[PDB]
Design a protein around this ligand. Structure first.
Ligand SMILES: N[C@H]1C(C(=O)O)=CC=C[C@@H]1O
Ligand SMILES: N[C@H]1C(C(=O)O)=CC=C[C@@H]1O
Lengths: 158, 157
C-alpha cells in the first residue's frame, strides 16, 4: 500500500543503501574520510578477534584516527564480490564480501591477506551509527605467518 | 496489491517460519532438523581453522551429521536470536549466540560459547543452503587449545 509512511521508509532505505555502497567502494586516500559517513558518536570496528572481544572504535574522530593506521597496515586493500542485503528494518543492512591486499603489521613479515567478511550497518538520521565487521581470524594468522591452531574432529561423518 | 508480490510475501512468510523452526530446534528434535532441507540441500560451517568450509551435502548426510553433533554438543542452545528478512524472499540472515558443553574425542570436556551469523537460502519452501559463520578462536579456547595473540603496534585508542 502507497502511504506517506511507506514512502518515508522506502526513501530512508534507498538513502542508506547508497551510503553502504559508498562505504564498500571507498579505497586509497579516500579511506581517510570514511568516518564522515558516521554519526558523531558512531561506532565501527572488528567483532571477530583472537581475544574474543571486539576492537570497537567509538566516535567519528577516533574512526578517522584509526583510518591513518589502517591505510599504513593495509595499504592497497580492496573489497570485492560485494553483496548488499536490505532488511525489514530500513536502518539495518548486512553485506557479504571478500577482501584482499597486502598486510604490513610491525613485528611480522609483509604478507598478502585474503578473507571473507560479513559487515553489519545500522543507521540513524541517514548516517551510520554502528558498523561491525566479522571475519575468520585464522586467515589473518596465515597472512602473518602465525601457526594456525588445528581442531581434530574425530568421527565426524564423511 | 499484485499477485506476484502477493506470491512473494507468502513465500517470505513461509520461509521465515522454517528459519524460526530451525533456530528453535533443540535436544532430540535435532535428529530431524535435516527434514527442513531440500533433498540435495547443503549445510555446514563456513569459518574453520583450515580456511575451507565443512559443508555437508544432502538431506541424508545432514541427518547423519546430526547424530555426531548431538554427541559432541549434547545440550546446545541458540539464544538472542535476531532474524533478518532481505529483499530476496528466499534469503535470510540470523545473528545469534550459542552455548553448551563441548565433548570432542581427545580434548577435555569444555563449555563452548560463540557468536554466530547464519545464512539461509531457500528453494521450493525448504532450505537449499545453510552456512554458519563464527569465531574459531572461541572453539579453540573451549577445548584448551592455545590461541596466538596478533600484535597490532600503533593501533590507536
Ligand atoms: N577493517 C578492514 C580495513 C578497512 O579498510 O576497514 C582494511 C583491511 C582490513 C580490515 O578488515
Ligand atoms: N553447527 C552447530 C551445532 C548445530 O546445532 O548445528 C551445534 C553446536 C555447535 C555448532 O555450531
Amino acid at each position: 500500500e502507497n502511504t506517506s509512511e511507506n514512502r518515508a521508509q522506502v526513501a530512508a532505505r534507498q538513502h542508506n543503501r547508497k551510503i553502504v555502497e559508498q562505504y564498500m567502494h571507498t579505497r586509497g586516500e579516500a579511506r581517510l574520510k570514511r568516518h564522515l559517513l558516521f554519526t558523531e558518536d558512531g561506532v565501527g570496528g572488528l567483532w571477530t578477534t583472537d581475544s574474543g572481544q571486539p576492537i570497537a572504535i567509538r566516535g567519528r574522530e577516533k574512526l578517522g584516527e584509526h583510518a591513518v593506521w589502517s591505510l599504513q597496515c593495509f595499504p592497497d586493500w580492496v573489497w570485492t564480490d560485494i553483496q548488499i542485503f536490505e532488511t525489514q528494518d530500513p536502518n539495518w543492512f548486512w553485506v557479504e564480501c571478500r577482501g584482499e591486499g597486502a598486510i604490513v603489521f610491525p613485528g611480522y613479515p609483509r604478507g598478502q591477506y585474503r578473507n571473507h567478511f560479513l559487515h553489519s550497518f545500522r543507521f540513524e538520521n541517514g548516517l551510520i551509527k554502528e558498523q561491525r565487521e566479522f571475519m575468520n581470524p585464522c586467515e589473518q594468522f596465515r597472512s602473518l605467518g602465525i601457526e594456525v591452531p588445528e581442531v581434530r574432529r574425530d568421527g565426524l561423518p564423511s
